[PDB]
Amino acid sequence: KSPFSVKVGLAQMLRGGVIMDVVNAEQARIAEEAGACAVMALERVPADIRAQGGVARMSDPQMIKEIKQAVTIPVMAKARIGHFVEAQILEAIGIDYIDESEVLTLADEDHHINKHNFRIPFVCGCRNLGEALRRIREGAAMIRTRGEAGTGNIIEAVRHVRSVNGDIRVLRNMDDDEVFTFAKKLAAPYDLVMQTKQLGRLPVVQFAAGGVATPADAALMMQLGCDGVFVGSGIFKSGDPARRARAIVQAVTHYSDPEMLVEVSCGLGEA
Amino acid sequence: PFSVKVGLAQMLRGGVIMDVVNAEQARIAEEAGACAVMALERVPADIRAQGGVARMSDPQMIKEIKQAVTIPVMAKARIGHFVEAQILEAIGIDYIDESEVLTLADEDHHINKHNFRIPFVCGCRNLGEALRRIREGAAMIRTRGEAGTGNIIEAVRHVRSVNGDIRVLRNMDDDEVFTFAKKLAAPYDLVMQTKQLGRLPVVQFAAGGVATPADAALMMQLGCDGVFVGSGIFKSGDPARRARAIVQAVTHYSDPEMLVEVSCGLGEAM
Amino acid sequence: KSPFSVKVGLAQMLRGGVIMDVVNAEQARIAEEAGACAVMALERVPADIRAQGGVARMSDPQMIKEIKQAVTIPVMAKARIGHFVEAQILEAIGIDYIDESEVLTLADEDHHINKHNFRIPFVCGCRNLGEALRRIREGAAMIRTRGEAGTGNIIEAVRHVRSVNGDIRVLRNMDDDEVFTFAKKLAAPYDLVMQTKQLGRLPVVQFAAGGVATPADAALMMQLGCDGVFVGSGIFKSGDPARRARAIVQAVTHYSDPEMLVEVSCGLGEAM
Amino acid sequence: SPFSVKVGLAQMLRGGVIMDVVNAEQARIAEEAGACAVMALERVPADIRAQGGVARMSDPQMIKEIKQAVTIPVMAKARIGHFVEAQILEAIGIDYIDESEVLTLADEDHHINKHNFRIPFVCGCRNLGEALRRIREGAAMIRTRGEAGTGNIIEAVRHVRSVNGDIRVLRNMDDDEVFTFAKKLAAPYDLVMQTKQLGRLPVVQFAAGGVATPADAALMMQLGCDGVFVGSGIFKSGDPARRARAIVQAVTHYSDPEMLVEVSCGLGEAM
Amino acid sequence: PFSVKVGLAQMLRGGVIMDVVNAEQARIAEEAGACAVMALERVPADIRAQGGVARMSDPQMIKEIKQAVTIPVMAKARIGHFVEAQILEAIGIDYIDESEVLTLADEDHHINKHNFRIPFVCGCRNLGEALRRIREGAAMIRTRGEAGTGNIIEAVRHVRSVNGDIRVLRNMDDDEVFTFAKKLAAPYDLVMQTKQLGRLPVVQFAAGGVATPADAALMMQLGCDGVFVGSGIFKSGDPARRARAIVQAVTHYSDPEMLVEVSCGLGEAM
Ligand SMILES: *C[C@H](N)C(=O)/C=C/OP(=O)(O)O
Ligand SMILES: *C[C@H](N)C(=O)/C=C/OP(=O)(O)O
Ligand SMILES: *C[C@H](N)C(=O)/C=C/OP(=O)(O)O
Ligand SMILES: *C[C@H](N)C(=O)/C=C/OP(=O)(O)O
Ligand SMILES: *C[C@H](N)C(=O)/C=C/OP(=O)(O)O
């Protein structure tokens, strides 16, 4: 079994879960108590990063350690795209996942982190199938839609989810002789394209992220065929986080049960 | 059956649907003689004024409005957000408006409304839009107009566009209908059904900017089956009497004497 | 049960066949003896139309009757696009199929013939799935690629075959909720799009046409998923049409047998 | 055959000249002058350019006559994308198929799926990305497209230099930057890495297009090609029998200017 | 001799150069282990924030900083302002940075640095720029980056551009180097010297936006000989410990465990 396939298997254990952005140990315990499958440690949530500006970097290791010691579920953390030394530091803290994240300030305009040089799994974002496969070829063990972080607006995540899944479906019936050109037009490595055609799905876990604000948003992503969701700003920037976090966890667990979605949405407060 | 939902929506023909935000408003609308109410948390004029993401309303406040009236209760879902619509159906309301006044959720696809048991309303700007919404499962169509402005001009453009093309279609050479359907980017079979009926195959309401009884009666005389009014009532001085005035204007849209009576001293519009 | 279903069913008999353009009863006899499934009677073959210019119309009923009397296989004839009276005339002659053909001079730039008003089946051309479905809804019982007629160059027919079958394969697997927008973007009738999605193929017989010059060209169209091929100029604008006609019939029959394809290509004389 | 077995067959053409021929008479001259293979076609590229018309696979009959006339390997052209023309050629029993841009393009968007065949293919290219895409489709040998039928080596020199230049760029490139380089070449990443590891093209690489003189042929070899194609330059000149030997000797002794002089002296009218 | 100045600058390989504004800061920088200090009156982030014309610093304040430390002292002169550089040399400092962070003084020409006894630093964005600066007499090169922002992205682009072209040059066919020098608009002889050495013929530091120890170590792993830090230290909470942290990160740029230690609880960056 390859070290990459082992990393792919680790991320498969989050299948069906919700990953919540947290900024302190208290928020972390709330997220775990509600049933988050993992927490994303950061010092400014995406809606704050947008509203404030300035350079957004890797979080201080000290605060990430506090979150790591406050929960038993997996802890992720963001590194800037291309900042392989920030990833080296996060890996040395002993967290479980690195998100090479477009919500932080781009560090390398032309290249991402070479993720195969690391032991621990990476998440990367994408807007289309070609981007996803390029990130995977670089070593991402898990893929999320980029969406539009910090807006509470689901429209871009829906577009990205549909783009990726729609091109996957196209790929399944496609004449094999046409797959070479299709790989060229996606600027994607052909072997990952054929692997995707063999599986009928993305070769790694695919979560939705960016703008998921409500239980209905979360279940919509799942019915569009994601394996889980990230929620960052939509929980703690609301008036009632500890109850809304549970509602979104419930909505991902029972995403095809409208009676359940009604119950968890009722009197949930201002989003 | 789609034809059952289409027939259900015919009960609204001749009525006014009013946007409401609480049980107090919902009763006023029912008292004035509204044929249905549209539950939401933010009226369209406040959505345009404040901005932000506008979504489906809290199930709780919709339940309150539902328990407070006997007339049918509608609610809005974002375009393409079929799970918001699943929740609305599970609340037990009567109609879902897949609404352009809320923030778009899917830029490329609307809800597959045939997957639902309860009827949908959709907006349109022209006959091709209306027909595509209907083929998707809309049981009722409203003009898009320009919600929140109190300005009737876009609703007039959309009404005239839909009815004008239906009137053109009615007399068109049969052989030319294939090309007409292509140019409308509308399904040919619904186009011929429209040609044979000589009107839209579902109930067609006016919406967007209806501010006065005269606006409401104008939409009726242009050939609509009814009108929506959201901001025009509850963004004005006296909504309780302005609501009844619009109901009267729709019921008596060809009686100028009646329109004068309900317009006189009506106060101040939005 | 429906009369359109009957016409669609009738054209099933051409599956696996070659349809040859002919300009006289002698060419028709050669086409039938070589194994054509049908002949297409016209006064000028597409390569001559292309080279000479002038207005190209329906052929004289007299020469169409002569071809109809010379063979027992079905006889087709071309009408100009939109010329429903040329089609009335051809139907009244008693031929078996009308091809509303882009190879003749366009008669109506905005409308095709309303083919459901007719008793006999029509063939129409297309370049993509939207065109195909629009022709079908107008009443075409059978579809062919447009290709590029009269050139002996298959590049456009390959593009059209791959475009139609490629979109059909995309449609087959598509999320149902997305098919409405797909139909909008094809400018195609939604119900025919959904029918195409359920079958996994075009609801009617689908032939390749335009530029098929060699046995290898014809077998290539069959391997790309066509039901048969039209050949006009490739056969009679060449050195030995009687032998080349045989070879293209055999190539379509044996399209997946390279040893056979070698046999019928070998020493076949100059192509167009 | 396995891909490596096909790559091995083309390797034994190293250091040779492949000559276009139109009859058994031209075929024997080519073999007797020391050609390493002959390319069977019914019109040389200089005549296809001049006369126009659709250019297709040659008649199996004439290909067979050439195949019997010589003992060296026999190649033939198929139009790009015309996989049935390639099925016929393979069934005739020749040794290589050239999926050739000098014939009329049959499929504008896709090349033949060359892995579906037993016998090796040659494909043309103008740059490294093109070469690697053809290889991934199954070509076992690459030639520069050059500019066929003009007797002008300028395009062939550009293509040789572009391919070899980008190969040289690969050798010292940072490993992390190779993913973006593969994207920019629109080429599959693993063949880019293979090219990086070999320091050369993963298949035999010949020059073709406008080779008219011994000096042109030795020039292509000195720029680092494994061999050359010559079509028009030989049998569209004054003495082809002697010019053919002179070009064979120039490729065998491409670094001996004294020999290059001897075979150029009094060689007659080039095309 | 140019080669004497080039050799002098090699003593800085492996170090951090810190911008300072007084003797207090200068000592802190020396205490933390800086290899040199860059005296100026306004740090780059304040130049971008306040505007105005930015010139050579007062000789007096440079003298104070010079008398306060033993490590080499650099100072900035405006690009093309060879008389500002004459004054800096006459003060007796160790290095002049012909600096793009100060207001340009000559749009078309840099200083003829070979006319000077003491070594110069110049910025660059690509290999052609570096080589032209070196031919003019620069004994040391830094990336231009984007000074004052705390953002590493332009420095990464410039480092990768310089090193990537050097790596391309190393393996290039000799015959193609003439055209390569033309396209770089760089002197051919320095290009071949670079090709033969396989690296820049002078010390190459990173500068512009280095805010954290991780940024500093990233520049080193990309192949720089050292780093400049101006605003990143003395526009933050605790500069005395952040300064030592960056020194440690440069000295131990391949030890992730060390980078964690010096980054932990480091406070708040600019
Ligand atoms: C990377 C970060 N955890 C993320 O994915 C943010 C999501 O968008 P948001 O709108 O903040 O939930
Ligand atoms: C969807 C909503 N019920 C509606 O129709 C909006 C009407 O526009 P307004 O200007 O608020 O009357
Ligand atoms: C309508 C005509 N018989 C046809 O189908 C086209 C023939 O084109 P060609 O390229 O001559 O085979
Ligand atoms: C495919 C053909 N034999 C070839 O490789 C190119 C020959 O071109 P020319 O310019 O005639 O030597
Ligand atoms: C010329 C000055 N010493 C310098 O290199 C500026 C660096 O940029 P900063 O963002 O202030 O570290």
PDB file of C-alpha atoms in Angstrom, chain C residues 6-165:
ATOM      1  CA  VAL C   6     -44.362   3.686 -38.366  1.00  0.00           C
ATOM      2  CA  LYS C   7     -42.036   5.826 -40.510  1.00  0.00           C
ATOM      3  CA  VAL C   8     -39.300   5.545 -37.898  1.00  0.00           C
ATOM      4  CA  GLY C   9     -39.764   1.771 -37.854  1.00  0.00           C
ATOM      5  CA  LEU C  10     -39.657   1.611 -41.647  1.00  0.00           C
ATOM      6  CA  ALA C  11     -36.172   3.148 -41.851  1.00  0.00           C
ATOM      7  CA  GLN C  12     -34.818   0.475 -39.456  1.00  0.00           C
ATOM      8  CA  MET C  13     -34.520  -1.748 -42.546  1.00  0.00           C
ATOM      9  CA  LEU C  14     -31.623   0.380 -43.873  1.00  0.00           C
ATOM     10  CA  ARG C  15     -29.473  -0.337 -40.807  1.00  0.00           C
ATOM     11  CA  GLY C  16     -26.139  -1.722 -41.990  1.00  0.00           C
ATOM     12  CA  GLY C  17     -26.604  -0.334 -45.510  1.00  0.00           C
ATOM     13  CA  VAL C  18     -25.030   1.957 -48.093  1.00  0.00           C
ATOM     14  CA  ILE C  19     -27.171   4.514 -49.957  1.00  0.00           C
ATOM     15  CA  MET C  20     -25.687   5.525 -53.309  1.00  0.00           C
ATOM     16  CA  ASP C  21     -26.334   8.636 -55.388  1.00  0.00           C
ATOM     17  CA  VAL C  22     -27.252   7.821 -58.990  1.00  0.00           C
ATOM     18  CA  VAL C  23     -28.000   9.993 -62.033  1.00  0.00           C
ATOM     19  CA  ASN C  24     -29.392   7.385 -64.459  1.00  0.00           C
ATOM     20  CA  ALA C  25     -30.954   3.932 -64.521  1.00  0.00           C
ATOM     21  CA  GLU C  26     -27.574   2.406 -65.389  1.00  0.00           C
ATOM     22  CA  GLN C  27     -25.896   3.823 -62.278  1.00  0.00           C
ATOM     23  CA  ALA C  28     -28.912   2.593 -60.307  1.00  0.00           C
ATOM     24  CA  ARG C  29     -28.537  -0.958 -61.618  1.00  0.00           C
ATOM     25  CA  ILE C  30     -24.848  -0.927 -60.658  1.00  0.00           C
ATOM     26  CA  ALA C  31     -25.713   0.331 -57.169  1.00  0.00           C
ATOM     27  CA  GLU C  32     -28.279  -2.426 -56.662  1.00  0.00           C
ATOM     28  CA  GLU C  33     -25.991  -5.189 -57.936  1.00  0.00           C
ATOM     29  CA  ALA C  34     -23.177  -4.018 -55.661  1.00  0.00           C
ATOM     30  CA  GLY C  35     -25.548  -4.392 -52.683  1.00  0.00           C
ATOM     31  CA  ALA C  36     -26.751  -0.865 -51.950  1.00  0.00           C
ATOM     32  CA  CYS C  37     -29.662  -0.790 -49.564  1.00  0.00           C
ATOM     33  CA  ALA C  38     -31.187   2.126 -51.534  1.00  0.00           C
ATOM     34  CA  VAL C  39     -30.380   4.668 -54.233  1.00  0.00           C
ATOM     35  CA  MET C  40     -30.612   8.442 -54.171  1.00  0.00           C
ATOM     36  CA  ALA C  41     -31.804   9.808 -57.514  1.00  0.00           C
ATOM     37  CA  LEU C  42     -30.473  13.261 -58.408  1.00  0.00           C
ATOM     38  CA  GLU C  43     -29.552  15.134 -61.571  1.00  0.00           C
ATOM     39  CA  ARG C  44     -26.103  16.298 -60.360  1.00  0.00           C
ATOM     40  CA  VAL C  45     -23.872  14.562 -57.820  1.00  0.00           C
ATOM     41  CA  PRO C  46     -22.693  16.827 -54.941  1.00  0.00           C
ATOM     42  CA  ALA C  47     -19.141  17.157 -56.328  1.00  0.00           C
ATOM     43  CA  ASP C  48     -20.522  18.461 -59.644  1.00  0.00           C
ATOM     44  CA  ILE C  49     -22.953  20.822 -57.877  1.00  0.00           C
ATOM     45  CA  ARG C  50     -20.007  22.187 -55.896  1.00  0.00           C
ATOM     46  CA  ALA C  51     -17.763  22.614 -58.943  1.00  0.00           C
ATOM     47  CA  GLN C  52     -20.321  24.000 -61.422  1.00  0.00           C
ATOM     48  CA  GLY C  53     -22.454  26.339 -59.324  1.00  0.00           C
ATOM     49  CA  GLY C  54     -25.904  27.491 -60.414  1.00  0.00           C
ATOM     50  CA  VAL C  55     -29.201  26.708 -58.677  1.00  0.00           C
ATOM     51  CA  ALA C  56     -29.638  23.027 -57.795  1.00  0.00           C
ATOM     52  CA  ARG C  57     -33.235  21.863 -57.416  1.00  0.00           C
ATOM     53  CA  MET C  58     -35.405  18.763 -57.296  1.00  0.00           C
ATOM     54  CA  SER C  59     -34.716  16.446 -60.210  1.00  0.00           C
ATOM     55  CA  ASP C  60     -37.081  15.992 -63.135  1.00  0.00           C
ATOM     56  CA  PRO C  61     -39.908  13.543 -62.255  1.00  0.00           C
ATOM     57  CA  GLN C  62     -39.175  11.720 -65.524  1.00  0.00           C
ATOM     58  CA  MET C  63     -35.621  10.780 -64.557  1.00  0.00           C
ATOM     59  CA  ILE C  64     -36.766   9.844 -61.050  1.00  0.00           C
ATOM     60  CA  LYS C  65     -39.387   7.492 -62.541  1.00  0.00           C
ATOM     61  CA  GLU C  66     -36.711   5.890 -64.742  1.00  0.00           C
ATOM     62  CA  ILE C  67     -34.604   5.137 -61.683  1.00  0.00           C
ATOM     63  CA  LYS C  68     -37.631   3.885 -59.729  1.00  0.00           C
ATOM     64  CA  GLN C  69     -38.422   1.472 -62.581  1.00  0.00           C
ATOM     65  CA  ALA C  70     -34.841   0.221 -62.883  1.00  0.00           C
ATOM     66  CA  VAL C  71     -34.434  -1.247 -59.370  1.00  0.00           C
ATOM     67  CA  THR C  72     -36.347  -3.022 -56.616  1.00  0.00           C
ATOM     68  CA  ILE C  73     -34.520  -1.413 -53.660  1.00  0.00           C
ATOM     69  CA  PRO C  74     -35.978   1.800 -52.149  1.00  0.00           C
ATOM     70  CA  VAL C  75     -35.505   5.058 -54.057  1.00  0.00           C
ATOM     71  CA  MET C  76     -34.839   8.411 -52.398  1.00  0.00           C
ATOM     72  CA  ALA C  77     -34.813  11.881 -53.930  1.00  0.00           C
ATOM     73  CA  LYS C  78     -33.697  15.308 -52.766  1.00  0.00           C
ATOM     74  CA  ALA C  79     -35.898  18.330 -52.190  1.00  0.00           C
ATOM     75  CA  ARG C  80     -34.557  21.767 -51.349  1.00  0.00           C
ATOM     76  CA  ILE C  81     -34.743  22.762 -47.697  1.00  0.00           C
ATOM     77  CA  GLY C  82     -38.080  24.426 -46.994  1.00  0.00           C
ATOM     78  CA  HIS C  83     -39.505  23.568 -50.437  1.00  0.00           C
ATOM     79  CA  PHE C  84     -42.589  21.681 -49.301  1.00  0.00           C
ATOM     80  CA  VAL C  85     -44.023  21.709 -52.816  1.00  0.00           C
ATOM     81  CA  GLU C  86     -40.996  19.903 -54.240  1.00  0.00           C
ATOM     82  CA  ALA C  87     -41.671  17.351 -51.475  1.00  0.00           C
ATOM     83  CA  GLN C  88     -45.385  17.134 -52.412  1.00  0.00           C
ATOM     84  CA  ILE C  89     -44.293  16.403 -55.989  1.00  0.00           C
ATOM     85  CA  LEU C  90     -41.839  13.706 -54.912  1.00  0.00           C
ATOM     86  CA  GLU C  91     -44.402  12.077 -52.632  1.00  0.00           C
ATOM     87  CA  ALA C  92     -46.867  12.047 -55.565  1.00  0.00           C
ATOM     88  CA  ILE C  93     -44.268  10.277 -57.742  1.00  0.00           C
ATOM     89  CA  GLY C  94     -44.276   7.387 -55.259  1.00  0.00           C
ATOM     90  CA  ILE C  95     -40.648   7.300 -54.143  1.00  0.00           C
ATOM     91  CA  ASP C  96     -39.793   5.819 -50.768  1.00  0.00           C
ATOM     92  CA  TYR C  97     -37.922   8.624 -48.972  1.00  0.00           C
ATOM     93  CA  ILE C  98     -37.330  12.348 -49.366  1.00  0.00           C
ATOM     94  CA  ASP C  99     -34.007  13.856 -48.319  1.00  0.00           C
ATOM     95  CA  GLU C 100     -34.487  17.511 -47.372  1.00  0.00           C
ATOM     96  CA  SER C 101     -30.926  18.226 -48.405  1.00  0.00           C
ATOM     97  CA  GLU C 102     -28.461  21.036 -47.718  1.00  0.00           C
ATOM     98  CA  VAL C 103     -26.708  19.939 -50.933  1.00  0.00           C
ATOM     99  CA  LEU C 104     -29.406  21.579 -53.041  1.00  0.00           C
ATOM    100  CA  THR C 105     -29.855  25.346 -53.000  1.00  0.00           C
ATOM    101  CA  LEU C 106     -31.626  26.492 -49.848  1.00  0.00           C
ATOM    102  CA  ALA C 107     -35.209  27.540 -50.611  1.00  0.00           C
ATOM    103  CA  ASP C 108     -36.271  28.845 -47.176  1.00  0.00           C
ATOM    104  CA  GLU C 109     -33.592  30.280 -44.905  1.00  0.00           C
ATOM    105  CA  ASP C 110     -35.692  30.249 -41.709  1.00  0.00           C
ATOM    106  CA  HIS C 111     -37.909  27.132 -41.842  1.00  0.00           C
ATOM    107  CA  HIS C 112     -37.613  23.492 -42.795  1.00  0.00           C
ATOM    108  CA  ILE C 113     -40.428  21.427 -44.306  1.00  0.00           C
ATOM    109  CA  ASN C 114     -43.174  20.412 -41.872  1.00  0.00           C
ATOM    110  CA  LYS C 115     -42.448  16.770 -42.456  1.00  0.00           C
ATOM    111  CA  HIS C 116     -45.314  15.410 -40.292  1.00  0.00           C
ATOM    112  CA  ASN C 117     -47.776  16.641 -42.970  1.00  0.00           C
ATOM    113  CA  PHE C 118     -46.401  13.958 -45.313  1.00  0.00           C
ATOM    114  CA  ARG C 119     -47.064  10.251 -45.615  1.00  0.00           C
ATOM    115  CA  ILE C 120     -43.592   9.173 -46.649  1.00  0.00           C
ATOM    116  CA  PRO C 121     -40.470   9.344 -44.465  1.00  0.00           C
ATOM    117  CA  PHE C 122     -37.878  12.097 -44.655  1.00  0.00           C
ATOM    118  CA  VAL C 123     -34.127  12.116 -44.145  1.00  0.00           C
ATOM    119  CA  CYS C 124     -32.533  15.343 -42.855  1.00  0.00           C
ATOM    120  CA  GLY C 125     -28.944  16.377 -42.199  1.00  0.00           C
ATOM    121  CA  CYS C 126     -27.350  17.654 -39.011  1.00  0.00           C
ATOM    122  CA  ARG C 127     -24.073  18.789 -37.521  1.00  0.00           C
ATOM    123  CA  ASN C 128     -24.875  18.454 -33.813  1.00  0.00           C
ATOM    124  CA  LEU C 129     -27.461  16.910 -31.514  1.00  0.00           C
ATOM    125  CA  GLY C 130     -29.615  20.051 -31.305  1.00  0.00           C
ATOM    126  CA  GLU C 131     -29.972  20.162 -35.083  1.00  0.00           C
ATOM    127  CA  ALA C 132     -30.736  16.440 -35.097  1.00  0.00           C
ATOM    128  CA  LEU C 133     -33.461  16.741 -32.480  1.00  0.00           C
ATOM    129  CA  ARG C 134     -35.024  19.797 -34.163  1.00  0.00           C
ATOM    130  CA  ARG C 135     -35.194  17.949 -37.488  1.00  0.00           C
ATOM    131  CA  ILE C 136     -36.726  14.928 -35.748  1.00  0.00           C
ATOM    132  CA  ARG C 137     -39.427  17.008 -34.047  1.00  0.00           C
ATOM    133  CA  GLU C 138     -40.258  18.524 -37.460  1.00  0.00           C
ATOM    134  CA  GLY C 139     -40.846  14.937 -38.594  1.00  0.00           C
ATOM    135  CA  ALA C 140     -37.580  13.553 -39.961  1.00  0.00           C
ATOM    136  CA  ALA C 141     -37.689   9.757 -39.727  1.00  0.00           C
ATOM    137  CA  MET C 142     -33.963   9.391 -40.305  1.00  0.00           C
ATOM    138  CA  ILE C 143     -30.915  11.567 -39.702  1.00  0.00           C
ATOM    139  CA  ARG C 144     -27.600  11.872 -41.507  1.00  0.00           C
ATOM    140  CA  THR C 145     -24.522  13.929 -40.728  1.00  0.00           C
ATOM    141  CA  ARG C 146     -24.015  16.933 -42.944  1.00  0.00           C
ATOM    142  CA  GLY C 147     -20.336  16.251 -43.469  1.00  0.00           C
ATOM    143  CA  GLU C 148     -18.847  18.323 -46.307  1.00  0.00           C
ATOM    144  CA  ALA C 149     -20.447  17.018 -49.474  1.00  0.00           C
ATOM    145  CA  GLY C 150     -18.568  16.712 -52.750  1.00  0.00           C
ATOM    146  CA  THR C 151     -15.049  17.028 -51.224  1.00  0.00           C
ATOM    147  CA  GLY C 152     -14.001  13.432 -50.609  1.00  0.00           C
ATOM    148  CA  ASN C 153     -12.801  14.698 -47.216  1.00  0.00           C
ATOM    149  CA  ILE C 154     -14.362  13.005 -44.178  1.00  0.00           C
ATOM    150  CA  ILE C 155     -13.091  15.508 -41.578  1.00  0.00           C
ATOM    151  CA  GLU C 156     -16.416  17.300 -41.217  1.00  0.00           C
ATOM    152  CA  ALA C 157     -18.461  14.086 -41.100  1.00  0.00           C
ATOM    153  CA  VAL C 158     -16.154  12.810 -38.347  1.00  0.00           C
ATOM    154  CA  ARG C 159     -16.650  16.075 -36.438  1.00  0.00           C
ATOM    155  CA  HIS C 160     -20.429  15.808 -36.746  1.00  0.00           C
ATOM    156  CA  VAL C 161     -20.586  12.115 -35.811  1.00  0.00           C
ATOM    157  CA  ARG C 162     -18.389  12.695 -32.757  1.00  0.00           C
ATOM    158  CA  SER C 163     -20.390  15.789 -31.783  1.00  0.00           C
ATOM    159  CA  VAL C 164     -23.781  13.999 -31.921  1.00  0.00           C
ATOM    160  CA  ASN C 165     -22.676  10.742 -30.255  1.00  0.00           C
TER     161      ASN C 165
END
